[PDB]
Each structure stands twice: as C-alpha cells, then as structure tokens.
Design a protein around this ligand. Sequence first.
Ligand code: 7KJ
Ligand code: ZN
Ligand code: ZN
Lengths: 298, 300
Amino acid sequence: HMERLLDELTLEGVARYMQSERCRRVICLVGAGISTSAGIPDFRSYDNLEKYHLPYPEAIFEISYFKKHPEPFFALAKELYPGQFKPTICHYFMRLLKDKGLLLRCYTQNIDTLERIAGLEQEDLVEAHGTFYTSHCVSASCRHEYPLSWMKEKIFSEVTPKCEDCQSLVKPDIVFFGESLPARFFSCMQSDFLKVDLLLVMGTSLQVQPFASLISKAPLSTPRLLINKEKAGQSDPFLGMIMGLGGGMDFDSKKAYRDVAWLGECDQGCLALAELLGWKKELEDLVRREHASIDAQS
Amino acid sequence: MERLLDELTLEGVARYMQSERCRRVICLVGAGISTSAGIPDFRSTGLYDNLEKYHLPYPEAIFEISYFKKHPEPFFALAKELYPGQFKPTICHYFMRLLKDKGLLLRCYTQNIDTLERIAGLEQEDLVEAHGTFYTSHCVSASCRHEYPLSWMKEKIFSEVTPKCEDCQSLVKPDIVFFGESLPARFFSCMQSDFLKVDLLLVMGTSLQVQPFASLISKAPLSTPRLLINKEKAGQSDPFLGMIMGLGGGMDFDSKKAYRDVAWLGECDQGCLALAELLGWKKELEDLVRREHASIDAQS
Ligand SMILES: COc1ccc(Cn2cnc3sc4c(c3c2=O)CC[C@@H](NCc2c(C)noc2C)C4)c2ccccc12
Ligand SMILES: [Zn+2]
Ligand SMILES: [Zn+2]
C-alpha cells in the first residue's frame, strides 16, 4: 500500500521526480553545513575564551549563565564574524526553488541570517533555532526590540548590549540552552508536513532538535534527499539504531525505498542537482550577480 | 530622417522597445536616480557647513585635484559625514538590472560615484562610471599608482586617517574624477563603440549640464529615440552656444520638427514603474525590488 515515488534512489531519480507534476511542494531542512563555505564554523564539529573561566564550554549558550555572564558569548560572536556575509550557492539554490514555485518552506537551524541575505523572505522561512536578525531586552516588563544593525554595532564595539530604556541585557532572538523553540516552528510544522512532496535535507547531521525528530514526520511516501558530508538520520534520536523503524532515514537496507544520500559539500550537490534539472546556468548567473552586489561593498 | 516611434510618448517608446528594432539600450543616469536612496545631489544645500573651520577658498575646492593634493583633509571630512550607512539602490537602479536580465542593456553610463549600480547587481562590463567611483582608490603618484579596495579606503576614512600609500607613502585618492582630472579611459573606449550601435537612449535623473553627458547626448545616431525621465526637460541647449533650435543633435521635445525625443516629467522611480507597466514588467520589477531590499535590510 506504500507508494514508490522515486524511480531510483539516486540524484538522477530525485531530479526526475522534481520535474514530475506530483512534486509541487518542497521543504528544505538546512544546518551548519550550508554555511561553512561562507566562512561560518561547522558547529557540528573556545580556545580564545580561556580567560572567561566557564564551568563547562556550553555555559556561554545557557540562558541562565548568559544572563549573569554575557561577555563570553558576545566576545565569541565578535570573533566568529566572517570577513563578509555572502550566502552560498546552496542558499541561492533555495531562492531558485522559490522562483520556480516549488519552495513550500525553508526550515533552518542556523542563526547566521544568510537565508534572508540570499533573498528568502520571512514567509518562506522558519528559523527553528531563532536568529540574530532581531534582539530583545531580557526584562519581561520591557521587551524592547532592537534590529541587527543596532546589535552589530554593540558587538563590534565590544559594548555589552544594554537596553536604552532600562539598561537591562539585550539578547538576540536565538534559542539558548534552556529556552523554548519558536512558536512559529510548531505552527508551520503541523501544516507544512501534511502536504510536503519532497524533503531536501542539506548540511545537517540531524542530531540536534528539532530536526532530529522532525525528519521522520514526513509522509511515508515523501522522498528525502540528504546532501551532507556524512549519512545522518538513520538512528532514532532516543533509541539509536533500530533498522529505521518509525520513519528513520533508510538509504542502504533491503527495505530502502525513498531516501537518497549524496555525500559531499552542499554547494557541489546543489550544482549537480541544478545541472540535472537544467538550472545550472541560471543558478550560477544568480550567484554571480548577487555575490557582485555584496562584493561591491568591499 | 527616419522616425522609429509611432508617437512621442512613453507608450510609443514602450512599443518601440518591444520591437525587434530595439536591441541595444544605453542608460545615461545622474544624481536624480540616487536622491531617493539618500545620496545628496551636489548640483541642488548646507552640505559644506561643517567644513567652515577649514577656511576653503570656495566650497568646491575640495574636489579640485591640485587643492586636494595639498589639503586632502576637507574632502575626507565631508566623505565621512556623507557616508549613508546602508546602500539601498532605487527602483530605477533595479529597472536597469531588469533591462540587463532581459538582454536589452548595452551599457549603463553613470555620472554618480555612489556605487549603487554595482549594488543593484550590474557588473563592470555593464557599467561606464563616467565620473569615476568610490569603489576603488589609487595612490596619486604617477610612478606607483598602487590600487586600493573600498574596504581599505573605508577603514582609513572612518579612522580619520588621511589615506597614504603603503608602498611610497603618497596620498591615496578614491577614483572619483576631480576637477582638473581627465575622464576615465573606459568612458572614451566604450563611448565610440556604443554610440554607433545604440537603438534607444534612456536618460534618467540628469540635468545634462555637466560633462560628459552635456555633450554626449547629441552624439547618438539621428534615428535613435531618446527618452528623458527627469524632473524637468533637459538637453535642449548647446553646452556652450545656448539655445539653437536643437541644431547639433540637441533634445527636441516640442518643436514642429520633433520626431524622436520624449520627456516624461517626474521622479525617476515613478517613471521606471510606469515604463515597466507598459512593458509588462511591473510585477517582476516590484518583486525584484522587494526581494533585494529585504536582502539589504538583512545585511544590516
Ligand atoms: C561607496 O563608498 C562611498 C560612497 C559615498 C560616500 C560619501 N558620499 C556620499 N554621497 C556622495 S555624492 C558625491 C560625493 C559623495 C560622497 O562622498 C562626493 C563627490 C561629489 N561630487 C563632487 C564634485 C562636484 C560638485 N563637482 O565636481 C565634483 C567632482 C558627489 C562614502 C564615504 C565614505 C566611504 C565610502 C563612501
Ligand atoms: Zn529594556
Ligand atoms: Zn604609492
């Protein structure tokens, strides 16, 4: 009774399916691997922070520790700022998907704002771990909002961002350890995953939540293409390897029917896929134009 | 005299642009296409008020090459003051990117130095920066001429350090054309090839009073239509001789012998929207502007 929508478990099969009338709504799930070529470190895989005496390394991303000791976070943020914020080919591939009427939603666990810089708009986006694009005063009574331009100025000046109204700490809208995921994630998830025809999973190893559990919630017939440095999503987040029961990624077993792994850099996978679709020149033209627009500032 | 427009209106130009005859469009653009982006028009007040302490002989002396070479501080003081923060191209800039994407843009000639054409996605091959640009800078010494990028020049201006060459310590100047300097060599090489091939001249946001546009407008082929999108009519007088009924290729919108020149008077952004509408491109243009502006807002 299960439906077999790919004619073969290869990138060629995914491309042919994307060209079929049945593939109308694509969801992208993207992680840190789509931004390493832009100079953002692969957080899946502190040495300058020895002076800050953190109990454990992860304490700088813990909401309670951050509220009383914010300097190491902003200091690290000051350092990890790349020379220039230029989205990658993979980012612009998703913009191409939108132009062609196939993008239902891009879910990202990155906080680097490169999806928005690439031209994806809020309606196309679910920032599942939040974003630097907006910040708020931590005081519940104030909650004054600050734009990224204001926050960047404070970080680069190494001035701990304080609210201009009440002088309390201003926090970017990223999900620290100890905080809930954005409400927009849960609302979009329920509607989106009932009607998704293809899952494009790029640059994430599906270990962190919510993607770790979300991958298995696609419809049973929806094909899932992983473009990543390594295979991922084969284990249950809590039970480990249980031969894919309950919707895990299954690329290799005798029961595989819909999951495809393309191992390598995200940029090269999107170019290979774009070529199979006849979109490579259009993608390379877009990237050249948009990179030039940003390079024009340097 | 060959008349290629069916009527001397925006509608007539739009029909011509959709014809096979109109393959190569040149844009000539001036300060009027960047005022809605917050870039000041020096031809139009109080820009120099904070330079009074420098006791300039005349305000524009800061842009004359010899005075700049001995007193560079006032120019850099003003540049720091006028840095807009974010650079957001206008609808008019993005209309030219659309012309490019649609294979109609032979060339954009600009007398602006603000780099908004490049930020809108026009590449060097598409551009003739007839008055130079802030995009690159050069050591002023003829025996060195080391080039410096915009990021280098920005860091010096914001640090309030007069830019000096790292090889010879001579003064480094943004590639703006100062009084007393020749126009860029690229302008002359492209002008002579382009103005032989151009099927339509689109002139936006320039008064056609300063050179090279003042003289260049009359060098188009006699049959090539010319559309002016500007707050006021321009290009009708000879740069030196004044009004001469349009002899020598001057713009002729209203005489009984007018045949190819059209003026649409208003803001450049509004005229480009109205032209895009008549080309069937308005949705594409408005989507492009929204998307690219959202991206610039995201770069913060
Ligand atoms: C992309 O990087 C940048 C662009 C613009 C500015 C500041 N900024 C803004 N907007 C303008 S608009 C304009 C100028 C100007 C200017 O410096 C400077 C030259 C002016 N023209 C002078 C002139 C006259 C009058 N007659 O001959 C000449 C020559 C016209 C920058 C300032 C600092 C760093 C980068 C900058
Ligand atoms: Zn506050
Ligand atoms: Zn030098």
